[model samples]
Target chain A: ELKSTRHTKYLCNYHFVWIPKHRRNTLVNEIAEYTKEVLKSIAEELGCEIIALEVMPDHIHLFVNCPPRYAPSYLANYFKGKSARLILKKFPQLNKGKLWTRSYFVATAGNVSSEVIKKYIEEQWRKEGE
Target chain B: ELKSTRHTKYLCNYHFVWIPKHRRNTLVNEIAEYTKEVLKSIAEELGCEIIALEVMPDHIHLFVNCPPRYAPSYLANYFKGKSARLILKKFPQLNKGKLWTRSYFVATAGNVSSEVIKKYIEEQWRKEGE
Candidate 1:
């Protein structure tokens, strides 16, 4: 008889990082729109739901519901790499250097606590005040 | 007899998350500048170096060189709590519910390669392109 494994649901939080080639701050509404669109598509394709998403000028925050079958690394790599190539193609100006950094921060929120993690991401805007 | 304690330096990467109130999008250059200014001051005061920082409409990403004497939790709370109150006060319109989410994501980056992590934050722009 073959051994079977159980599948569990994972609520993952991913914080993605990247900056422009010239060290320029590219905080723009269009960038946020673009980020949400691509990420939402991925969620739809993977049958996963995006709980929270915020796009910064140089990085992004994503709180998502991950299905047991897909790995967080795979999802992130696909989002970052493919998006870089595509952005370069559309915006010729972005072709100068590497578009993204090579690493990301991922945490499993299902076990520890979801509210605590969600609260942190929600209040990040205050880091600049005063 | 007192036991000798060993000091350990922690390289922490933080993803500060939050969304603009009223479900509105607040992507602007001023916000980024504000975030950088506040963060740089804290870094300078703490005698720490900001390895990388990216500010979005609703969140921010920080990669820092932390001193062994300081605790990451305390540092993060100081940055988040105070900054939130200041921003909300400055902009009366922002006087709403909690300025930030109460929790955050912190990871020890010292054990991992910095190069890998830096690349991730730098590539966030591409997530939207493709």
Candidate 2:
């Protein structure tokens, strides 16, 4: 569906992908749940809405609907830093280094194929989770 | 339709609307055509594609498809300044007064309603141009 402001109708949906440094399988069970919570909070503050999110052991898939005012890079960075802010300290056992890698992947949602791709992203780990 | 790069599937369609300072009737005949030409060149250089454009006397409606790498604001500014760059000098009747207004309206294209809205923007002033 199309979202609107006072005069503009837009759908700035971004499919973002990133991973933990060294592809560490730290995002299991408790950490994954906590990471989801943090990501949601960050989305609220950033004026973004998550369409599909999957937190895997080594990588993450986040498809977010954002306002056009923000850049793709800024959103990717904020998601990585803020979501991992508490996690880095909360999960001290992840002492192998940084929680996020400098590299990431981002794509803007298309008009016609938007839904199909979102569906694809959600099925990354299949069975779905909280 | 959807466009993609190596890692990103993005449309980044922007329906931009702006007016001449004070909504004046400066964008007529020769200037209108020239503005369109400039806009086309700008889009080509920016790696953007113009889906629809209407150079009305008082205001303009330019719907463009861009990559996720660019923000809406950046595209809008580039279109305004660069398109008007040559037009200001060529059309002395403009009085060189700010060719484009600072404010603009921007919207992201949605999944289902993209064609309908783009259709609406296309029919804004109707009747083709040069």
Candidate 3:
């Protein structure tokens, strides 16, 4: 489900997880901080609210509330594409391979409590456990 | 996540619940059958798969596996809009106020097992209990 407003009652929320092309642990220090800033900027540009976003050493986790006009994959790619370009442009010291893997883990979380979504989505990371 | 194959992996699914305008018992008999047909047709047009669709006396429950190219509300209104027009055209007896209420319930179910989603969404219907 999406969020409800006076004119709308949608609950379009998604939990997105993605890693580097080789699962490299590159998202650390200033690189991680810059990545967060760029991602938040992209979210604002898309008019999507970041319910929660965390940058891990090897991956990124984002829970967003979005309007129902965008597709799930579309959103994930947008964040990945835009953030990768922006972060790389700003930090030339770290010449790297592709910034993100083509694969990602995305799930929907609505019609349930928002609190439940935060915890449940954290547990959805099967590979993260490994 | 959306649907994944040997070359692709996504798990994008949604559970949707909607009711006739004023919660009228309009979805009955042949009207219901025709409604289902039109809904299925629309799903195909959008390249979506209907995981399950159940028609109650006054409401509808649909679980669909979709590509990441569509948004939750877009899919819901598409089904509601197209089905209403088609159903009404086939049955003149439904000289009704409206085919569906503006309000609907849509939730995301991904990052979990598909079988779990099958049971969980059914339980998301709080109004059904009333």
Candidate 4:
């Protein structure tokens, strides 16, 4: 479904991916859960909606339905900055270096259904397992 | 000119407009300039480029070249949230109620040139004067 502003109706869904600095497998167990919670809270704080999110051992995947005013880069930075700070603060053992890389992957997915994206993100573990 | 990520090249431009609560003319003199500076700084901090910004007596107009990753609503909320808090904190006398209304106007202008938008925003004061 599309969302409406006073002047526009937009379906702004983004698929975002970012990895840890040096591709370290630091996101696991408590860190993974905490990162997920932090990202969801940040999205709520920003008034954006999180459709799906997965925190892997080495990277993160997020499918979000954001308002049209923000850029994908801004959202990525927001998630990366806030989550990294809080995660590193909460789990000091993971702080050997920067928590996340500066670069991220973002793609617009207007024509695709959110369900497809959500399912795709959900299947990452199985894909890796197989 | 356009910017490139590893996978995409994009020129994303948005023209955003927002107003203070009750259309109050609180943004003037020091507040006006301060709002401009704050917005610019926030944009810079987010790694988004601000093409032009004009803080008027009762409203604000910003033209920015942001990445595709961000939606316009996120950008609007970011500017409004950060600026309102800082502006209200820095100059307490202007705090009558909420600093900004919840609604904002954002339009994508890919076919149009940035110069046209910049000139249009610059002419706001003149249009009001005349």
- lDDT (tens digit, per residue) of candidate 1 on A81-123: 7766766666665678776555455533332233654555544
**lDDT of every predicted structure (CA atoms):** 0.51, 0.68, 0.70, 0.68
Comparing 1 and 2 by TM-score, which wins? Answer: 2
Ranked by lDDT, the better of candidates 3 and 4 is 3
Residue ranges of candidate 1 with Cα displaced over 4 Å = A1-24, A112-130, B1-130
Per-candidate TM-scores read 0.38, 0.65, 0.73, 0.48
Which residue runs does candidate 4 get wrong by more than 4 Å?
Answer: A112-130, B1-3, B6-130
> What C-alpha lDDT does candidate 2 achieve relative to the native structure?
0.68
Predicted model with the maximum DockQ:
3
DockQ, 0 to 1 scale, candidate 1 = 0.06
Q: Which run of 10 residues does model 4 chain A get worst, by summed lDDT?
A: A121-130
For residues B1-130, could you state the per-residue lDDT of candidate 3 as single tens digits?
Answer: 3455432345677777766664346678888888888888999999888998987665677888887767776788788888888887788877576766566666776545545433322332221221
Q: Give the interface-residue alpha carbon RMSD of model 3.
A: 16.9
How many Å off is the CA of B7 in candidate 1? 25
Q: Write the per-residue lDDT of candidate 2 for residues A1-25, one digit (tens) a residue.
A: 6565643345567767766665456
Please tell me what DockQ candidate 4 reaches.
0.09
Error of 4 at B36 (Å): 32
CA displacement after TM-score superposition, residue B106 of candidate 1 (Å): 23
Write down the C-alpha DockQ for each prediction: 0.06, 0.13, 0.22, 0.09
Instruction: Please state the interface RMSD for every predicted structure, separated by commas.
Output: 17.4, 19.0, 16.9, 19.7
The TM-score of the first chain in every model comes to: 0.65, 0.80, 0.77, 0.81
Candidate order (TM-score): 3, 2, 4, 1
